[PDB]
């Protein structure tokens, strides 16, 4: 109930209250706030745009990727660096080519952020752009590319490190020679899913979801019954990114978890997969104790687009939580069947307040 005022305050006229909202959503915000924070990326105030990219990477939702890639072309350097780090935290391979361009940004601190991000994504296409970045005019940028090639650490880098230590000059030689003096991936994290340490398990589910290989589906389904609820919800989000329809039934069981964030993550993942078998469980999830879970129920029903949720969403237009109603109005707009039209004209004349307000709105938009 702290989140929603920050979400409303993101569109406030004053630039200072926008900053305080984006600032606090970077600390508190969850998946409910990326659609408003994606709009905040278009702000007038560079401080707002910066803190927004800061928050979208901290939330780690894959829908911020195409926005943050255009934020890489922002006029403020400190905004481009916040989008670089944010895309590094999301780990989406679509940022690799534009981050390779940011590896040659006019500002030194953006090149550092671009090198870091490509290191955290671990895509091998950055290996030679990072190798040539070892000759950058700025030593701190050279140092960041050395660390970025270390995080990737394929044999493509051992190849380039050997060629560099045999042939290179200056810092690039110092890096490669030390590389030799001190020294596939999806299979390591699957085994890490069964680790005794909780952060290792969590990191494993975080990693397998960004990688997106469907071999990690069955192991992540088993992680849905993990002892810790952070691993449970992480494997749920990972299964949603993977999109494999094998996790549909075990995710529906996750809709009945003790932890509300696990149910919240299970609902969003079932909307990503889009299987209609989620419609019935998600509909009864609109009546959940947790206002977040009620929100993820409506949003997922909007992603699926099944007309069986029309009237449950009309019901949801009178939720106590503000953005649960906001999500329900969005969901009826996505579905938009002939049933939705008939339901909202009844609501236009018989409704009250917010439900009436959005019923009139829907009829206004869908006219031509
Ligand atoms: Na900031």
Numbering used by the authors: 23 to 205, 222 to 406
Task: Quote the authors verbatim.
In the dimeric structure, the binding concave surfaces made from the variable residues from each monomer face each other and the dimer resembles a closed bivalve shell.
The crystal structures of the two bidomains were determined with a resolution of 1.94 and 2.55 Å for A3_A3 and A3_bGFPD respectively. The structure shows an open conformation but the two domains are in contact: the loop linking the consecutives repeats of the A3 domain interact with the GFP binding surface of the second bGFPD domain. Importantly, the crystal symmetry generates a dimer with a neighbor molecule via its A3 subunit. This dimer is identical to the A3 dimer and to the A3_A3 bidomain protein. The first one is the dimerization interface established between the two A3 domains within a dimer, and the second involves the A3 domain and the bGFPD domain of the same molecule. The dimerization interface between two A3 domains (1170 Å2) is higher than the interface (638 Å2) between the A3 and bGFPD domain of the same molecule. Thus, the interaction between the bGFPD and A3 domain observed in the crystal structure may not reflect the interdomain interactions taking place in solution, for A3_bGFPD, but is rather a secondary consequence of crystallization of the dimeric form. The resulting curve shows that A3_bGFPD is rather compact in solution (Rg = 26.8 Å, Dmax = 90 Å), and could adopt different possible geometries of the closed forms.
